[PDB]
Amino acid sequence: SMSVKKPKRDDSKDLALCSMILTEMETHEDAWPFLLPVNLKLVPGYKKVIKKPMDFSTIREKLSSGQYPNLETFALDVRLVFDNCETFNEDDSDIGRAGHNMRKYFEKKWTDTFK
Numbered sequence: 001s002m003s004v005k006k007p008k009r010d011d012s013k014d015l016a017l018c019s020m021i022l023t024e025m026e027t028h029e030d031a032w033p034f035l036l037p038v039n040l041k042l043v044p045g046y047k048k049v050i051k052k053p054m055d056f057s058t059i060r061e062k063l064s065s066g067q068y069p070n071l072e073t074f075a076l077d078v079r080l081v082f083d084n085c086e087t088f089n090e091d092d093s094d095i096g097r098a099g100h101n102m103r104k105y106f107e108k109k110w111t112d113t114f115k
């Protein structure tokens with residue numbers, strides 16, 4: 001509260017660390033469904049069903065232009081990619097499995113890096 005400050009983690013390297021994690025996700029062999037925004041004009045249902053589209057190239061642009069105020073807002077966008085994937089794809093599909101794999105991959109990096 002006012003004039004009562006909690007000690008806080010050193011956040012000075014967060015930008016660099018999130019960038020490294022994003023690079024690792026961009027180069028994962030199962031990243032192909034998530035590299036670019038889904039084409040809302042060509043993919044039936046996607047625009048109406050998925051209220052907040054997100055993809056790695058959009059996350060990269062936001063990270064490169066100071067649009068994440070902290071590391072948690074970055075993690076929210078990453079998770080959103082995988083949440084959107086689950087909404088739109090059966091678990092037993094190539095893209096469905098890709099999303100599950102990439103989520104698992106991300107969360108271990110996240111834990112190992114910041115926890």
Ligand SMILES: Oc1ccc2c(c1)N[C@H](O)CC2
Pocket residue numbers: 033038043046084085088089095
């Ligand atoms: O067969 C298809 C064709 C296009 C897409 C998907 C499956 N799922 C992705 O989540 C997004 C776009």
